[PDB]
Ligand binder design. Sequence first.
Ligand SMILES: CC(=O)N[C@@H]1[C@@H](O)[C@H](O[C@@H]2O[C@H](CO)[C@H](O)[C@H](O)[C@H]2O)[C@@H](CO)O[C@@H]1O
Ligand SMILES: [Cl-]
Ligand SMILES: [Hg+2]
Ligand SMILES: [Hg+2]
Ligand SMILES: [Hg+2]
Ligand SMILES: [Hg+2]
Length: 263
Amino acid sequence: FMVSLPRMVYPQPKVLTPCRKDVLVVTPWLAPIVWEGTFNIDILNEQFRLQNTTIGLTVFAIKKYVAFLKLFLETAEKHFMVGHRVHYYVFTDQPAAVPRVTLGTGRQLSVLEVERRFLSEVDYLVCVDVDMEFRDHVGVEILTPLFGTLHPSFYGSSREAFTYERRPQSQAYIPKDEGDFYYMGAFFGGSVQEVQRLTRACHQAMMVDQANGIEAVWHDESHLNKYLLRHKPTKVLSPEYLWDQQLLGWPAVLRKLRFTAVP
Ligand SMILES: CC(=O)N[C@@H]1[C@@H](O)[C@H](O[C@@H]2O[C@H](CO)[C@H](O)[C@H](O)[C@H]2O)[C@@H](CO)O[C@@H]1O
Ligand SMILES: [Cl-]
Ligand SMILES: [Hg+2]
Ligand SMILES: [Hg+2]
Ligand SMILES: [Hg+2]
Ligand SMILES: [Hg+2]
C-alpha cells in the first residue's frame, strides 16, 4: 500500500518541452536513464520516505584499500541518501582498521570480516567500489528493482568498441552485433532480491568459466554486462554517477559530477 503524496508546489512539467535535448533519457525498454534535470528530487524524496525506505550500501575494502574508507564514508554522509535510512556494510580483512566516521541520525555501519541478513535489514542494495568519493547528490532517484551505470569511458562509443568478453567459450560472451550499453562494475544495485539474483548468476557463470579454463577479459564486469544484456535494468545511471575527472575532465553533458575516482 502506497499512501498519497501531500500537496506540493513545483514547476509544471511541460509536455512539449523535452527534458534534455542533448542526451537519451529513456532506454528502448522504457527504463529511465538518470541525468540531472530529469527528476524533481522533492517528489521522489516524498515517495520513498512515505515508504520508510532503507538503503544498504556495500563496499569491499581489502588490504591497502582500507585507506580509502574514511573519505568514502565521510563524503557518503554528505551526499548519499541524506534524509533516508542508510545501512553501510563494510566487508574487510582488517576490521580494526575501519575508521571511526561520525554518522547522521538514522544511519548505521556494520563491519563484516572476510546473506539473508540483507533481506530483513534493507529494501535496496547499492554496490560500489571504495576507492571513490561522493562530490554531489546521489539519492533515491537511482532506486529501482535493478540498475546499472554507464561506464564513463564508453557512454559515447558504438557497441563494437565495447570491451565485452568476445570469446564464445566464455559465459560472458557477447557478439559484435549485440549490446545496449557498457556498464561499469563499480556501481550497480536494486532491490535485495534482484541484486542477489544478479550476484548469484554472476558467481555461477564465473565458476563455469573457471572449470572451462577461461577468465573473462574484465572479470566480474564482463559477467555483469552479460547479465544486464539479458535482464534489462529498470533504470540506468548516467556517467554523472561514476566519473574520473582527472582522466576525462568535465564535459558539458555532465551538469554534475556526483561519484568520482580518487586521484
Ligand atoms: C578511453 C579509454 O579506453 N580509457 C581506458 C579506461 O577505459 C580504462 O578503465 C578500465 O576499463 C575497463 C573496461 O574497458 C574496466 O572497467 C577497468 O576496471 C577500468 O579500470 C583505463 C584502465 O585500464 O585505461 C584507460 O583510461
Ligand atoms: Cl561492488
Ligand atoms: Hg526535464
Ligand atoms: Hg552488493
Ligand atoms: Hg562474480
Ligand atoms: Hg556480476
